[PDB]
Design a protein around this ligand. Structure first.
Ligand code: PLP
Ligand code: PLP
Lengths: 368, 368
């Protein structure tokens, strides 16, 4: 099946990380950023680039006093292990409702430097309510569960005074609203809403989280240096990382932050993803062969939309035909095992392209 | 001081990592690799890119049967912690003679999952001989010590049958000769001879090293998943990494590998760095205000040249003037504390630009 060009989106990338890298943003690598490549991360030109990223994120996320942008190599998966060693003192409570929220709880359960976590589960497509427990000093959940398309509210739970709020915003940060004052560690990686590459983690940390990192280091608890949050904080405060970061990753990230801030900031990004996701969900509701996987509209992610298909319409065949027509990465999370499409709607994704995608899906399904 | 343009090198980047990224190599990001950006690392287009990197390195390093290219996020610093958990069974022997060889031994000493390492030290600017011990199952040293400009032979020591040869080739791999059959783990990162970005580690592993990784995993020894060599092996064998890799790091690396292979492979790269380094060392010998830091010519690195300056010629002032004229990153290793310049001569660096640099240094020194 050859989809007519007239109905095709301008950009066919609907992947949930890595995701659409804007043409003008990628072009900065051979132009405005060409002179930064291959230069020292211990010298002013690359340190100023890290500085642009940190102050840019501080502006975009309206950071309260004493909050800091901390960064290091590895991506969000490395941050899970760094946080298990460095942020959790004795015990944590985790909400699990998909791949990424479950994987952080599983990393904490296996880590022999911290206690057995309390795990509150819910079926995929749903989420438990943010909650606390008197025996925990960390409470963790994902702002956006990328495998299921579920977005959860980011609020400091009642009676959680003695616990840090540790939020995996890998696919949520930059596309969803957030009051950073409600968090202690709001972490992410650049390949989703920030339209950059993986291999770097970023974490917005509160004064309580920074003090906690210092207090845990002061106990003498061992941590491999690569996963050390005290070393990552020491370096981040001076526009550096512990080891050599990727200049391309920082250059693409800084360009996306500038673009988001220049468009009106987080409020603009949230309006944009609301617009894209409204097009996707309204279409999924209208068509008799589709339905949103997430039944609670309050949990339906603005940035990652999981659309279930009925028995007689094979979503896998639809995804294959779309891919053969250059409309890529609509395949559901590889481990979920559902007759579903997963569509990313991060701010780089044009809302009109989400509309064009739905028309392409209708066109293909009518010819199956 | 304004250095006349006629004597300036075409490219002023002499940094030892990050290092000179060729422009035509950087331009593939906006052309032949542009469509790869923002696409899934779990789908064929990015998996084929990893495939190109693995096959390319297999060709460049003339890999014997059963040797495999393993990769993961983090850079070489992450590989030290991954190797301490995953390659060392009971005890290791380390050679230390600068920043990077010492830091790996220090990471192993602090790791509470393995024994206390045997450490064989030498003064900076020198190196101990590769040697073994009956109580160790791993012997480790750096092919190239980036902090002192010392290159060491890579050979399997006599009577080391029960020990894996674990070589930190971060600044050596692709610019220095090597017989891979003499190694069990030959690891590096892409920001030096491979003219790409940091944040990714690569390791050429022997069948004995791969079997060792499996045997250590089979004991049930815990390892944080991000630093897991069994998981990195499982993913690498199917052109993947454990978590999201940077597409730009892979795309720049594959272009450099292709450029090196097309030029005549490792033999061509070694001739090129021999040519560049001959220009630097002969000039350092000729001038009465300079001398190579490394007194043993057999240990003088072809890729990283440390040139000491006499008391009355301030190398720091020279470095500052060069930097103000766009000739950057000649500053010595930040912790060495010597009146010295450090010049990288990786294959992307044109030998004529090393000659031009020496003329620029003469010009500046004559006007101090
Ligand atoms: C020899 C050597 N080993 C290890 C490293 C650490 O590399 P990375 O910053 O990629 O972790 C470096 C960095 O310069 C190095 O030159
Ligand atoms: C919510 C979430 N958490 C964590 C991760 C891990 O990210 P990375 O590959 O950067 O380690 C991902 C990856 O898709 C994710 O979406």
């Amino acid at each position: 099946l050859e989809i007519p060009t007239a109905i095709k989106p301008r950009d066919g990338r609907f992947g949930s990380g890595p995701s659409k890298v804007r043409l003008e943003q990628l072009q900065t690598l051979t132009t405005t950023a060409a002179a930064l490549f291959g230069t020292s991360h211990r010298q002013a030109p690359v340190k100023n680039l890290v500085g642009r990223v940190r102050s840019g994120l501080a502006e975009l996320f309206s950071l309260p006093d004493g909050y800091e942008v901390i960064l290091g190599n590895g991506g969000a998966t490395a941050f899970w292990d760094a946080a298990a060693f460095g942020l959790i003192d004795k015990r944590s409570l985790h909400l699990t409702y998909g791949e990424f929220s479950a994987k952080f709880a599983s990393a904490v359960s296996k880590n022999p430097f911290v206690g057995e976590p309390i795990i509150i589960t819910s079926d995929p497509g749903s989420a438990p309510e943010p909650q606390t427990d008197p025996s925990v000093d960390v409470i963790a959940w994902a702002h956006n569960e990328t495998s299921t398309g579920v977005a959860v509210a980011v609020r400091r739970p009642e009676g959680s005074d003695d616990a840090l709020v540790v939020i995996d915003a890998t696919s949520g940060a930059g596309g969803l609203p957030v009051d950073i004052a409600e968090t202690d560690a709001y972490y992410f990686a650049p390949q989703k809403n920030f339209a950059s590459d993986g291999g770097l983690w970023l974490a917005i940390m509160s004064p309580a989280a920074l003090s906690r990192i210092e207090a845990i280091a002061a106990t003498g608890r061992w941590v491999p240096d690569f996963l050390s949050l005290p070393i990552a904080v020491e370096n981040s405060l001076k526009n550096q990382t512990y080891n050599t970061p990727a200049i391309a990753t920082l250059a693409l990230l800084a360009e996306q932050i500038d673009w988001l801030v220049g468009n009106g900031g987080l409020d603009w990004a949230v309006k944009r993803t609301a617009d894209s996701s409204q097009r996707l969900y309204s279409w999924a509701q209208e068509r008799p062969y589709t339905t949103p996987f997430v039944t609670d509209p309050g949990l339906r992610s603005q940035v990652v939309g999981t659309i279930d298909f009925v028995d007689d319409v094979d979503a896998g065949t639809v995804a294959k035909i779309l891919r053969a027509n250059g409309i890529v990465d609509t395949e559901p999370y590889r481990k979920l095992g559902r007759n579903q499409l997963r569509v990313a709607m991060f701010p780089a994704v044009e809302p009109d392209d989400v509309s064009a995608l739905t028309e392409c899906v209708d066109w293909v399904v009518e010819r199956l």
